[PDB]
Each structure stands twice: as structure tokens, then as C-alpha cells.
Ligand binder design. Structure first.
Ligand SMILES: N[C@@H](CCC(=O)N[C@@H](CS)C(=O)NCC(=O)O)C(=O)O
Length: 101
């Protein structure tokens, strides 16, 4: 069940980016975490056999189906635009640090 695997992945990784391989928003979100020296897990929905079902479950969980859907410490933070805003505000690295602490 995709909803289970989603929950498993976000619980087992500090940062998860549900992504597609040719999405410019996703590339930007990867770039942001990379530039912060934060390790992330990428799930490429376009390469998964049931990625459509994953995208459905991400809609049900988060309220929207667009990629990227980004989780930090098991908490949905937004898409690419939200993540950049949270980073600009100094809200993102504290969430990353809760993970470890
Ligand atoms: N406002 C969103 C924009 C994301 C977005 O529009 N993503 C496109 C892919 S580039 C999308 O998900 N399109 C529909 C789809 O692939 O299902 C964000 O900042 O994350």
C-alpha cells in the first residue's frame, strides 16, 4: 500500500523529496538541500511502477498532488516554493535539527 510506504520512508529519513526526474521545481528543491549540506532521500515518482498511486496518496495526505512533496522530520513542509520561503525565513534548518536531536 503506497500510503504505508510513504509513511515508512518519511519516518526513516530526515528529509524526503517526492519528486519527478524532469521537474524543474524538484531540481531546485534538491539544489537547496544540497547547498545546505543536508542529506535527503529522493523518491522519483515517474520511475516507480505505481507512482500514480503514490501521487494519489500524497494528495490525500498533503492536500495537493504536485511534485515535489517535501517532508522534514516526518512533517510535510510544502512544495519547492514553500521550502524556499521557509529556508529564506530560517525555519527549515531547525526542523532538520529536530530530526537528529
Ligand atoms: N507550486 C509548486 C509547483 C510544482 C509543480 O507545478 N510541479 C509540476 C511538475 S514541474 C507538477 O507537479 N505537475 C503535475 C504532475 O506532474 O503531476 C511548487 O512550488 O512545488
Amino acid at each position: 500500500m503506497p500510503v504505508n510506504q510513504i509513511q515508512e520512508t518519511i519516518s526513516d529519513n530526515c528529509v524526503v523529496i517526492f519528486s519527478k526526474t524532469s521537474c524543474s521545481y524538484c531540481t531546485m528543491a534538491k539544489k537547496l538541500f544540497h547547498d545546505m549540506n543536508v542529506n535527503y532521500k529522493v523518491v522519483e515518482l515517474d520511475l516507480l511502477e505505481y507512482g500514480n498511486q503514490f501521487q494519489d496518496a500524497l494528495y490525500k495526505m498533503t492536500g495537493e498532488r504536485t511534485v515535489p512533496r517535501i517532508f522534514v522530520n516526518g512533517t510535510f513542509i510544502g512544495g519547492a516554493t514553500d521550502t524556499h520561503r521557509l529556508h529564506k525565513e530560517g525555519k527549515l534548518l531547525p526542523l532538520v535539527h529536530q530530526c537528529y536531536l
